[PDB]
Design a protein around this ligand. Structure first.
Ligand SMILES: *[C@@H](C)[C@H]1/C(=C/c2[nH]c(/C=C3N=C(/C=C4\NC(=O)C(CC)=C4C)C(C)=C\3CCC(=O)O)c(CCC(=O)O)c2C)NC(=O)[C@@H]1C
Ligand SMILES: *[C@@H](C)[C@H]1/C(=C/c2[nH]c(/C=C3N=C(/C=C4\NC(=O)C(CC)=C4C)C(C)=C\3CCC(=O)O)c(CCC(=O)O)c2C)NC(=O)[C@@H]1C
Ligand SMILES: *[C@H](C)[C@H]1/C(=C/c2[nH]c(/C=C3N=C(/C=C4\NC(=O)C(CC)=C4C)C(C)=C\3CCC(=O)O)c(CCC(=O)O)c2C)NC(=O)[C@@H]1C
Ligand SMILES: *[C@H](C)[C@H]1/C(=C/c2[nH]c(/C=C3N=C(/C=C4\NC(=O)C(CC)=C4C)C(C)=C\3CCC(=O)O)c(CCC(=O)O)c2C)NC(=O)[C@@H]1C
Ligand SMILES: *[C@H](C)[C@H]1/C(=C/c2[nH]c(/C=C3N=C(/C=C4\NC(=O)C(CC)=C4C)C(C)=C\3CCC(=O)O)c(CCC(=O)O)c2C)NC(=O)[C@@H]1C
Ligand SMILES: *[C@H](C)[C@H]1/C(=C/c2[nH]c(/C=C3N=C(/C=C4\NC(=O)C(CC)=C4C)C(C)=C\3CCC(=O)O)c(CCC(=O)O)c2C)NC(=O)[C@@H]1C
Ligand SMILES: *[C@H](C)[C@H]1/C(=C/c2[nH]c(/C=C3N=C(/C=C4\NC(=O)C(CC)=C4C)C(C)=C\3CCC(=O)O)c(CCC(=O)O)c2C)NC(=O)[C@@H]1C
Ligand SMILES: *[C@H](C)[C@H]1/C(=C/c2[nH]c(/C=C3N=C(/C=C4\NC(=O)C(CC)=C4C)C(C)=C\3CCC(=O)O)c(CCC(=O)O)c2C)NC(=O)[C@@H]1C
Ligand SMILES: *[C@H](C)[C@H]1/C(=C/c2[nH]c(/C=C3N=C(/C=C4\NC(=O)C(CC)=C4C)C(C)=C\3CCC(=O)O)c(CCC(=O)O)c2C)NC(=O)[C@@H]1C
Ligand SMILES: *[C@H](C)[C@H]1/C(=C/c2[nH]c(/C=C3N=C(/C=C4\NC(=O)C(CC)=C4C)C(C)=C\3CCC(=O)O)c(CCC(=O)O)c2C)NC(=O)[C@@H]1C
Ligand SMILES: *[C@H](C)[C@H]1/C(=C/c2[nH]c(/C=C3N=C(/C=C4\NC(=O)C(CC)=C4C)C(C)=C\3CCC(=O)O)c(CCC(=O)O)c2C)NC(=O)[C@@H]1C
Ligand SMILES: *[C@H](C)[C@H]1/C(=C/c2[nH]c(/C=C3N=C(/C=C4\NC(=O)C(CC)=C4C)C(C)=C\3CCC(=O)O)c(CCC(=O)O)c2C)NC(=O)[C@@H]1C
Ligand SMILES: *[C@H](C)[C@H]1/C(=C/c2[nH]c(/C=C3N=C(/C=C4\NC(=O)C(CC)=C4C)C(C)=C\3CCC(=O)O)c(CCC(=O)O)c2C)NC(=O)[C@@H]1C
Ligand SMILES: *[C@H](C)[C@H]1/C(=C/c2[nH]c(/C=C3N=C(/C=C4\NC(=O)C(CC)=C4C)C(C)=C\3CCC(=O)O)c(CCC(=O)O)c2C)NC(=O)[C@@H]1C
Lengths: 172, 266, 162, 289, 172, 162, 172
């Protein structure tokens, strides 16, 4: 897996070149965003249970067929698995946010997830909807201007949105 | 197939392909498009050098002297086709290439191989190639004016179900070609009249989690195994192992005398 | 790659845990370091040709038989001198990667893992590269945290070679 | 096999159990049984808290994304395994535990310690773990689909010293590798280094002298060098291991554990004296020929 | 193959939902940039031969092992094929820019391409280097301020760079 | 999926060509249309429940035997009315997809292809849905380009059914 | 695995046949050649490191793309893996020479090796070239007339060449 830094390194190594002054400066700018990235990971993690439960509640309210008898999230084991998956995906999204690179999310969580779900009969579109609900809640929590030093977090918030969207597409 | 499956299987572009027909009083552009499509199909999407083009056959088609089916046959009989697909290939690889190129499908059964091996032994290359283009299957799908196109991913009248699964062995993706000879991936399953799992597009992928080692890569080893240790429950087995354990797994399989049929990234 | 960020996540994932204060503190440590690491990388990169040529000459001085003895493993011809300069450049460039990544990950992945087999197979003396690495340590002109981090990676390679 | 002494040795429950196999097209109850077995075996029958479960690895096992062996491998490489067995242990202790958990047997020789200590030192813990799981021995006994289990019974390839050493590592059914009298200490460092064995002392509950453990120094040797000469007229000698000596009290009693070599003709007196010391006989073994 | 519009549609149909007011406004903002997108396609197309040839010459100057006898781009046939691949990839990048979606790359240009290169012995890392060089030359072309109604094309340039990166990663 | 942009590309691609002025003009045509399509999609979405309900009753009025005959294919019971309002909702929803896409693609891919097999298999009259579509044409209230593009897709469905 | 003797036995058992007088005579001739076979195995083994390293050097000299940055044999771990593979192949070729039957090489080395390299992206055509370089060095070593009882080793040399050819064909 890569982080924002080693992503650049690996690209440079395959070309056998030193990082350019432009690339180094791009990393310096990333370093300048580090505190915002740490806060964003902290804020999502601090609210993880709420993000998952509220998104799952909203999801089943919109898709009652999931929780009717015979539905894919019906029975405790399957509901429990569904809630577990929502948290796994959120957790890996926070991993990607922490590292600044999607490789952890892609390599460990999403790679092969669609196939697992298709084989199981898990409705991918409903998972994607759930991920979208978690995304909205997470972005609001990150952007909340209270109790934190004020500043512009649009760049980090956009990166997090991309990670959530990756997860949604990977299963949708 | 529909988007939901075609996207996973890497065959969206095949599904949206439209048969190309040479109409009466076609323009020069339409003839050009048809010639390009024939070269792409019959030559399995190789990069075609200008020195390899059939100048004369192209002229005759453009002059409406010969039909599209005649032009397909001219290309199939050409030295270009021979050099690409016949002179350096074993016969069974050559035959499945003819089925892909000329009928747009994979072979259905071993007897198709036997028929065409006999025909080559009897009448040589020209008789073998003409059998495809003159067949009822060619005439009823493409006639004289439609460029052949791949059909194996769609339910055809009088096909065998295994034609669909086998299509993924001979069609490897849009940006692929039948250029390197080689052996047929179909030999065993044709000979024994069986099928093999479809690992194409993104269906080869499997979950990694924390179990995929230092490179976060799993490899899928498909083996044929017997009991020559613990009890063997299936004659056909798959193992998922990380990069770090791949050498150990090969050595284990090797020590047991079991046969590796395929390995790929998962 | 052993970098602070990826290792933090990998350890958390092993336990199926969200990141916590421990991992956030790992991140602050990385941030405290990163600007110095990047400044070191730029300085080594800007002086790369001087450092590499100087290091090669330092090896030739300490081990004169390498430029005098015939053999594929020696630098008595231009072929061998070019291999040698290339190799030293590899060490330097990858060290700059370690400074950018904030860990020995790049050295481990690209150079150190398997260096023993290579040096044994092609009859290269690890003492040659130790000498080059000492030259680079003593001539990069880095100060402060950049010097400290650069030398830790240079010493990491030296220690590996001995 | 082990029949008469099975219960007192703590082996009877394993005699009564079958290997836990994950069949192709397994059911969910099959997966749960594997998960339970792997946690009990690989984590040495420690209680596992819900917060410590490897939920992701369990999911992948349940889904068939990893076989039993790969699930074992994941558990063995987890921070949970390392916290329990690596970070607080002498590496020889770690190797003992790995053998018990992953191969179901005790180390046979010092060569095994050399191999695994060097492998750990040169390539790290993960590499060492792989060596157990990718071993020929692991493959032959458990293969891809069977949870590792204790191999009490004699098999091809065994050595006798393995049998005695299993009861240095296995201390009974209601017990864990982290709840044994010797605590973190390597059980076999000395046995392996000297290639010696110890009299077997079965688990508590079924063996009164279960707590007998020798000291660092000042132990009685196993065999009666010199024969019966020091004892005068004696027919045969026995080595008796005694534990829980308290009655006279300090300083008359220094160590509560003692091994003595006594002649046949004094066994009656010896048992009488032991009883009055309060002690419990741990083992009796012929000491002369 | 999707475009920027039908991508949204396909997801919405999988959920059985109408496009939301936000999705419609999103697609509307896409329409607002339509002229910039069309110009970017027009510019890369107008310079396609120079982009390809200049990138090729640069690649072989950085990687002269490719063209020396025995090299993967030695002999006219192989050089001709290499040039075709560079042109093909650039053409498909313009398609993705035109449609506003990556599916055309994933469906056609990149579909099995890594497999093809491994089978042929084409050095995929080198192809990635050549793609990166076309990328740099293409974005300068797109950003050229002369002879065009001045405005901010940063979003499209970022999108185009993404398509080039997707191609490079597919063969890297 | 039939849409101006995807058809420009697939045609150029089939001919091995870069996009030229022709495909650029196709894109301008798409841009000229798109806002009206998006406006039309919004207007239809906001009234989806009214249109679907009114269309369902329009069919019931025109074909009263449907609410009175017992049978899986009829709307005499509650399930049938649910099936029916569902089907009409499908038509209306997918039509808005066409307005968003700027072509019949969504109708072709999701509804039209195979509909003849479905209606025959389950004994569903094409006329019922034509009447429903006719209602939506008469009631969607659109005007200008939005009306023109929307009626083309409704009529396209009607023509496919008749 | 089979050796030269059990190969014949297996074919006979499948027929329910005693070995014929001719088959026994052929094995006697095999026995009479045994000393040469042992010498060939000993000579190849005794020069294994030189054979491998000389072959590797020559390969990278002729195919420098392998070792340029981004090349499959670039980086110490990949270079070490490549040298390991060469040695493995040489080792199993010696095993086949020793037993007089290719089975050990086919079952325990080449089994799935082409597919493995394809999956890994290892250039099989370059492995084949490496194997050929080892072949040519090995045969000269086996044929060296110095310090050995003089005689005709043509048959054994041809057999060894055959084993090398299998390996080169298999990996490509
Ligand atoms: C970034 C890509 C650069 C840029 C682009 C840009 N273009 C416009 C406006 C227009 N561009 C066109 C394009 C064409 N008209 C034609 O007839 C054809 C030939 C077939 C083409 C390709 C058109 C029609 C317009 C609108 C009218 C006009 O000429 O201005 C803009 C202005 C904003 C807008 O959205 O229209 C911009 C920003 N501008 C830069 O500075 C970048 C270097
Ligand atoms: C082709 C391989 C070359 C060759 C071989 C060759 N060898 C012999 C004879 C012998 N070689 C041995 C070998 C060994 N003796 C040992 O103790 C060991 C170490 C374990 C080895 C490897 C032996 C025992 C013999 C027999 C005695 C003798 O020295 O002759 C021959 C002669 C024929 C025979 O089969 O005996 C030959 C031909 N000779 C060449 O010229 C080739 C270059
Ligand atoms: C009743 C004693 C009290 C009560 C109930 C209540 N339950 C929920 C939500 C859920 N209940 C379940 C339970 C099951 N689902 C199953 O599949 C099975 C096994 C067959 C069981 C037992 C589940 C899974 C949920 C959550 C998902 C869902 O909504 O279906 C609620 C709503 C909770 C919420 O946050 O929406 C309530 C109110 N509440 C009381 O106060 C009663 C005393
Ligand atoms: C919840 C929003 C939806 C849902 C989920 C659901 N998932 C499963 C089963 C599995 N989910 C996973 C996923 C993972 N396991 C991992 O370790 C990781 C990280 C690498 C992931 C992403 C797996 C592997 C399974 C299968 C094994 C298991 O049971 O854990 C189920 C149960 C399916 C069944 O029939 O057993 C469910 C219900 N289902 C919905 O309906 C929601 C839309
Ligand atoms: C972004 C979505 C929101 C936001 C973030 C933001 N944070 C800072 C600055 C700091 N945040 C921290 C964080 C922590 N300190 C700790 O000790 C821990 C616990 C382990 C954490 C998570 C720190 C250290 C700083 C710097 C010092 C300070 O006092 O601020 C900023 C300011 C810019 C900067 O990056 O330094 C910003 C913008 N602010 C918003 O308005 C968003 C809602
Ligand atoms: C209906 C009960 C279930 C269902 C079916 C379904 N099948 C397909 C696609 C195919 N079905 C076949 C099968 C055959 N083709 C043949 O020629 C033969 C006889 C010799 C058989 C048995 C094939 C080959 C395909 C794929 C090619 C094609 O679609 O033409 C689909 C379509 C999937 C898609 O994405 O397009 C469907 C829907 N689906 C269900 O949900 C039911 C459980
Ligand atoms: C050039 C930068 C590098 C290079 C290229 C190279 N490629 C080939 C051969 C093929 N390239 C393709 C790719 C495509 N075909 C398509 O239709 C599509 C679009 C959908 C793509 C992307 C294919 C299929 C082939 C094989 C068919 C054929 O070669 O005709 C070669 C030729 C190899 C050979 O002659 O054996 C070359 C040289 N080589 C380099 O060294 C550069 C790094
Ligand atoms: C310079 C200090 C001395 C010297 C150098 C020398 N090196 C070689 C050959 C090789 N060097 C390497 C090293 C690396 N390859 C890598 O990928 C990396 C990590 C990124 C390293 C450090 C390798 C693998 C080789 C062999 C293969 C190759 O040529 O690339 C030679 C030639 C050896 C030979 O037999 O050809 C030489 C001369 N020699 C001296 O005398 C200097 C003092
Ligand atoms: C037969 C002459 C006498 C006899 C024998 C007897 N032995 C056992 C059980 C075991 N014997 C062994 C011995 C070995 N294990 C080894 O690894 C080695 C060398 C490789 C030896 C010699 C072991 C370990 C056991 C127990 C484990 C097992 O049997 O698998 C028994 C059975 C004990 C029981 O059932 O409880 C018996 C009967 N018994 C007599 O009475 C004869 C005098
Ligand atoms: C509770 C009344 C008292 C108490 C209990 C206590 N026990 C432990 C730890 C263990 N208990 C057992 C017992 C069993 N394990 C089994 O599998 C079986 C059935 C065959 C039994 C009877 C074991 C083996 C352990 C150790 C394993 C583990 O994970 O702990 C503890 C934990 C001690 C500690 O964590 O340090 C405790 C607290 N403690 C009291 O104070 C009560 C009087
Ligand atoms: C060197 C200064 C002296 C010396 C050392 C020596 N040690 C051994 C053997 C072993 N050393 C260990 C040590 C450890 N095991 C652990 O788990 C740890 C902590 C993580 C340590 C430090 C062990 C267990 C062994 C036994 C296995 C092995 O042999 O490696 C030897 C070899 C003894 C033998 O007879 O083989 C030696 C030589 N010896 C000296 O003379 C020096 C004073
Ligand atoms: C007090 C802090 C803890 C404690 C003590 C305790 N000890 C005993 C019994 C014995 N203690 C010894 C100790 C020694 N023998 C030696 O030779 C030496 C070194 C020179 C020592 C320290 C011995 C031999 C005994 C047994 C004989 C005797 O009782 O005198 C007991 C009584 C045990 C009993 O079961 O009656 C106790 C209570 N107990 C605690 O709970 C404290 C933590
Ligand atoms: C000499 C008569 C004139 C001339 C030559 C010139 N050629 C190039 C570049 C190339 N030449 C080739 C030719 C071949 N490559 C092959 O593999 C083969 C078949 C074996 C041939 C015939 C190629 C492919 C190139 C391009 C890539 C490369 O440089 O290798 C140049 C440089 C062109 C550039 O833009 O870099 C030149 C100068 N130029 C003159 O003016 C002479 C009269
Ligand atoms: C050297 C001439 C070429 C080369 C080789 C190369 N190989 C690998 C990796 C592997 N090679 C194997 C092969 C085997 N493993 C075995 O145990 C056996 C016998 C049963 C064989 C034949 C395997 C399994 C691997 C991967 C796993 C492992 O390395 O243990 C690499 C590294 C690949 C990578 O790092 O991704 C390389 C470089 N590469 C070249 O370029 C030469 C032409």
């Amino acid at each position: 897996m890569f982080d924002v830094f080693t992503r650049v390194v690996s690209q440079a190594d395959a070309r056998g070149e030193y990082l350019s002054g432009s690339q180094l400066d791009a990393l310096s700018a990333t370093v300048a965003e580090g505190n915002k990235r740490i806060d964003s990971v902290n804020r999502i993690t601090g609210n993880a249970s709420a993000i998952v439960s509220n998104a799952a509640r909203a999801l089943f309210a919109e898709q009652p067929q999931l929780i009717q008898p015979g539905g894919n999230a019906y029975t405790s084991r399957r509901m429990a698995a569904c809630l577990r998956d929502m948290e796994i995906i959120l957790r890996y999204v926070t991993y990607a946010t922490f590292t600044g690179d999607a490789s952890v999310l892609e390599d460990r969580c999403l790679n092969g997830l669609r196939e697992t779900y298709v084989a199981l009969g898990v409705p991918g579109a409903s998972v994607a909807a759930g991920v979208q609900k978690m995304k909205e809640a997470a972005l609001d929590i990150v952007n909340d201007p209270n109790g934190i030093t004020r500043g512009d977090c649009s760049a980090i918030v956009a990166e997090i949105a991309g990670y959530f969207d990756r997860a949604a597409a990977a299963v949708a | 197939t529909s988007l939901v499956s075609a996207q996973r299987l890497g065959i969206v572009a095949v599904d949206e392909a439209i048969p190309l027909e040479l109409r009466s009083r076609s323009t020069e552009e339409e003839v050009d498009a048809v010639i390009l499509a024939v070269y792409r199909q019959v030559l399995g999407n190789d990069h075609l050098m200008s020195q390899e083009r059939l100048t004369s056959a192209e002229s005759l088609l453009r002059g409406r002297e010969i039909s599209v089916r005649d032009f397909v046959r001219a290309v199939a009989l050409s030295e270009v086709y021979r050099q690409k697909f016949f002179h350096s290939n074993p016969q069974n690889r050559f035959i499945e290439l003819n089925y892909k190129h000329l009928l747009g499908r994979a072979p259905y059964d071993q007897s198709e191989i036997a028929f065409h091996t006999d025909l080559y032994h009897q009448g040589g290359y020209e008789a073998e190639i003409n059998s495809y283009i003159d067949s009822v299957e060619y005439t009823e799908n493409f006639g004289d004016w439609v460029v052949p196109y791949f059909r194996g991913f769609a339910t055809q009248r009088n096909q065998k179900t295994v034609g669909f699964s086998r299509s993924f062995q001979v069609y490897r993706g849009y940006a692929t070609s039948d250029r390197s000879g080689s052996r047929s991936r179909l030999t065993r399953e044709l000979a024994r009249n069986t099928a093999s799992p479809v690992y194409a597009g993104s269906t080869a992928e499997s979950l990694r989690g924390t179990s995929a080692g230092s490179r976060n890569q799993m490899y899928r080893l498909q083996v044929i195994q017997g009991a020559a240790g613990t009890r063997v429950r299936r004659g056909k087995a798959e193992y998922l192992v990380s990069y770090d354990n791949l050498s150990a797994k090969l050595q284990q399989i090797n020590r047991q005398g079991d046969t590796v049929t395929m390995i790929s990234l998962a | 790659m052993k970098t602070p960020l990826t290792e933090a996540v990998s350890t958390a994932d092993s336990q199926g845990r969200f990141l916590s204060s421990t991992e956030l503190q790992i991140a602050f440590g990385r941030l405290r370091q990163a600007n110095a690491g990047l400044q070191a990388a730029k300085a080594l990169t800007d002086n790369a040709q001087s450092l590499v040529n100087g290091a090669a000459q330092a090896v030739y001085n300490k081990f004169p038989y390498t430029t005098q003895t015939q053999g594929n493993n020696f630098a008595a011809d231009q072929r061998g001198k070019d291999k040698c300069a290339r190799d030293i450049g590899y060490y330097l460039r990858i060290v700059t990667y370690c400074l950018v990544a904030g860990g020995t990950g790049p050295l481990d992945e690209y150079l150190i893992a398997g260096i023993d087999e290579i040096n044994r197979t092609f009859d290269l003396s690890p003492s040659w590269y130790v000498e080059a690495l000492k030259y680079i340590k003593a001539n990069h002109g880095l100060s402060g945290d950049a010097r400290d981090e650069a030398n830790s990676y240079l010493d990491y390679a030296i220690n590996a070679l001995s | 096999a082990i029949t008469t002494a099975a219960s007192r040795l703590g082996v009877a429950p394993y005699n009564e159990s079958r290997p836990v196999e994950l069949r192709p097209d397994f059911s969910l109850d099959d997966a749960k049984m594997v998960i339970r077995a792997v946690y009990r075996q690989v984590l040495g029958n420690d209680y596992i808290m819900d917060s410590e479960r490897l939920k992701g690895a369990e999911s992948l096992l349940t889904n068939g994304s990893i076989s039993v062996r790969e699930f074992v491998r994941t558990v063995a490489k987890s921070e949970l395994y390392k916290k329990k067995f690596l970070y607080n242990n002498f590496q020889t202790r770690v190797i003992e535990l790995n053998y018990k958990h992953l191969l179901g047997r005790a180390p046979f020789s010092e060569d095994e310690v050399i191999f695994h200590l060097d492998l750990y030192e040169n390539q790290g813990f993960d590499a060492d773990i792989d060596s157990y799981i990718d071993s020929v021995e692991y493959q032959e006994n458990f293969g891809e689909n069977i949870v590792p289990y204790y191999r009490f019974n004699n098999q091809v390839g065994d050595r006798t010293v393995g049998f005695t050493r299993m009861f240095r590592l296995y201390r009974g059914y209601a017990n864990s590798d982290r709840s044994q009298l010797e605590r973190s200490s390597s059980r076999l460092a000395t046995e392996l280094g000297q290639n010696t064995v110890s009299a077997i002392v079965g688990p508590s509950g079924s063996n009164a002298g279960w707590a007998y453990r020798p000291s660092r120094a000042g132990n009685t040797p196993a065999k009666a060098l010199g024969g019966t000469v020091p004892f005068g007229q004696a027919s045969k000698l026995f080595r008796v291991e005694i534990t829980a000596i308290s009655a006279p009290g300090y300083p008359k009693v220094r160590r509560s554990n003692k091994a003595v070599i006594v002649p046949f003709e004094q066994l009656n007196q010896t048992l009488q004296q032991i009883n009055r010391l309060g002690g419990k006989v741990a083992s009796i073994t012929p000491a002369s020929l």
